[PDB]
């Protein structure tokens, strides 16, 4: 299974204040703290991808950390590959999530060329599940497996056109891979809304390998046959950057200054 049928088009938009995250696991109250770390700059030019299926999808760079954002309903966005070669010549990290549990699994994966996931209805199990993993041929040796709650959730109920924007920052350093995230509600106003909100550390994982590239998984329902669909996401790249960060009385980062804007 190596179906090279997904494609993606691109454009550009403004990341005003987004992509700030708690730099350490420390409380601070009503104090201005300065730090040099991998951050995404204010008013940074951020790539805007649309991913689509027709019945051409180039693999993305990773360096000094990535900011990834999206805002899709039904959680059609389902994961990432992070890795040195993504071909079983060096090991690589797979993230996949569904409605009840995410897996974090780093192995010598031969992904074939374009990896997507294939949740479909099975007649004999009377229910929806992943048919066959088109993402890869086989895993050979694995050295780390973690399972937890889905890093992403929908809001209670569903208001009309009322998307939530989901933000992730991915870092690799000293063997560890660090996920930060935030899920913010959107008045359906504009992309990366005006305002401020800082990403909390979700997982902080001693993977221990080498990352130089990354890619994302979209789901397809296989309705009779790969019924065609669309998704959006935004990619920003981090720089070694200085920030001055403002903590309120409650020790949430309420505002920030990008020190070279």
């Amino acid at each position: 299974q190596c179906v090279n049928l997904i494609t993606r088009t691109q454009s550009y938009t403004n990341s005003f204040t987004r992509g700030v995250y708690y730099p350490d696991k420390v409380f601070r109250s009503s104090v201005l703290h300065s730090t040099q770390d991998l951050f995404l700059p204010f008013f940074s030019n951020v790539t805007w991808f649309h991913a689509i299926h027709v019945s051409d999808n180039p693999v993305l760079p990773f360096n000094d950390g990535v900011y990834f954002a999206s805002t899709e309903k039904s959680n059609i966005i389902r994961g990432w590959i992070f890795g040195t070669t993504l071909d079983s010549k060096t090991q690589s990290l797979l993230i996949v999530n569904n409605a009840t549990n995410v897996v974090i699994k780093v192995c010598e994966f031969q992904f074939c060329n374009d990896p997507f996931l294939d949740v479909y209805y099975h007649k004999n199990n009377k229910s929806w599940m992943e048919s066959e993993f088109r993402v890869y041929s086989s895993a050979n040796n694995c050295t780390f497996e973690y399972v937890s709650q889905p890093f992403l959730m929908d809001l209670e109920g569903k208001q009309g056109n009322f998307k939530n924007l989901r933000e992730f920052v991915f870092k690799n350093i000293d063997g560890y891979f660090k996920i930060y995230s935030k899920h913010t509600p959107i008045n359906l106003g504009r992309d990366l809304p005006q305002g401020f909100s800082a990403l909390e550390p979700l997982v902080d994982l001693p993977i221990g390998i080498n990352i130089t590239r990354f890619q994302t998984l979209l789901a397809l329902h296989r309705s009779y046959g790969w019924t065609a669909g669309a998704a959006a996401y935004y990619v920003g790249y981090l720089q070694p950057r200085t920030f001055l960060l403002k903590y309120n009385e409650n020790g949430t980062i309420t505002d920030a200054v990008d020190c070279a804007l």
Binding site: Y22, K25, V26, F27, S29, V31, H33, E200, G251, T252
Partner: protein, 141 residues
């Protein structure tokens, strides 16, 4: 509420541990003061937040006149509550001044070995905060 050595998750230090009115985030483990020094830590097992303040300390100024004049002295424990030097029954090895009836809270510190008199004089030895001390005989009564 007892001065102790502590190690929380490898965050080592020394101080009194007290319950805190600070409310940390779920991922945060310890709080840093304006001086960026640690002043709270969240217990790893039961996730209550504890203030840390160092165990009590201060200067120890000895009020001594000319050795030829006399050999007796008072001691000022600087910035120290005068109930807390008794609880500090330590670096000064001389325990004796824990058991003194002649004990006085000046605003400058706990003064031990000198007695307060209501009558006033020129400042012979300065203590601080309006207080001075002198070696002399009172005999008012």
């Amino acid at each position: 509420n007892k001065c102790v050595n502590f190690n929380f998750n490898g965050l080592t230090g020394t101080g009194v541990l007290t319950e805190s009115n600070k409310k940390f985030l779920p991922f945060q483990q310890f709080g840093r003061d304006i001086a960026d020094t640690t002043d709270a830590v969240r217990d790893p097992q039961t996730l209550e937040i504890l203030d840390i303040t160092p165990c009590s300390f201060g200067g120890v100024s000895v009020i001594t006149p000319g050795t030829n004049t006399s050999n007796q002295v008072a001691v000022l424990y600087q910035g120290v509550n005068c109930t807390e030097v008794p609880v500090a029954i330590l670096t000064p090895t001389w325990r004796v001044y824990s058991t003194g009836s002649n004990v006085f809270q000046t605003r400058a510190g706990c003064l031990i070995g000198a007695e307060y008199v209501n009558n006033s004089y020129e400042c012979d030895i300065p203590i601080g905060a309006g207080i001075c001390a002198s070696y002399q005989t009172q005999t008012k009564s």
